Design a protein around this ligand. Sequence first.
Ligand code: MET
Ligand SMILES: [Ca+2]
Ligand SMILES: [Zn+2]
Ligand SMILES: [Zn+2]
Length: 277
Amino acid sequence: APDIPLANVKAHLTQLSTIAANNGGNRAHGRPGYKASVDYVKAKLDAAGYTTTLQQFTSGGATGYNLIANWPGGDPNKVLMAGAHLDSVSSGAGINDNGSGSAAVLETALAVSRAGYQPDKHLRFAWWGAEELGLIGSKFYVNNLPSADRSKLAGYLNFDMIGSPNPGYFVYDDDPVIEKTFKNYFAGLNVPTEIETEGDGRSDHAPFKNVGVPVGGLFTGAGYTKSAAQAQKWGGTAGQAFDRCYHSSCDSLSNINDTALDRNSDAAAHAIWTLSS
Ligand code: MET
Ligand SMILES: [Ca+2]
Ligand SMILES: [Zn+2]
Ligand SMILES: [Zn+2]
């Protein structure tokens, strides 16, 4: 797998920050900042050769969208998917929640095209709308997939909050093979990992997990407080939240830890290449 360049991921975060500032200060469902975010991600993918689909749905009286991107080729009967929600809450730009995961998945998709990668499994990437209203966009996607198509899913990898300013390195404990793939990557960097417990079923992997699709993912922490033992293994500040700007107006470009964002972007690419071979 390629090393994902941190500067390219940060450039996507800068564009999402400008989009929020030009649209009222947020990228929330039903507000202009959300569709403008979708348009930016779609344009980058279409230029790189992906087949893109916009899936529209209505929630809370307003139109939302999921953006699905398929890399042509690979086995149609074994699909590996990776995704991230693209909406924010209405209090701010949502740069760590979840510009961080959205930008890492987007740069991984661009890296597949730049590398001229031809995977054995078919690759599909998704950016979900309306996650902050209760996983509405990912539930819409799973509820509308025919059973024949659901059975072709080999795994779904989720990236939601991966650049927290006082980070921890948490790996989901769902499918064992996906979990081992991430743990082995961090082992090679000599960075310890812990099992994800703060978010539980509260992100877009839940609808997939509930229908039997293997899932996994990465998380760097939200409102919970980092312990002394955790600061000893990862640095940072014990007694402070992992993300002091969770769902706040201060979840801006300054609310990102570059080391954690780079490590988790590189781990995302490593898992995508490893599991699609
Ligand atoms: C990964 S669980 C914590 C984040 C939560 N899904 C959110 O969007 O706020
Ligand atoms: Ca990197
Ligand atoms: Zn989130
Ligand atoms: Zn959130």
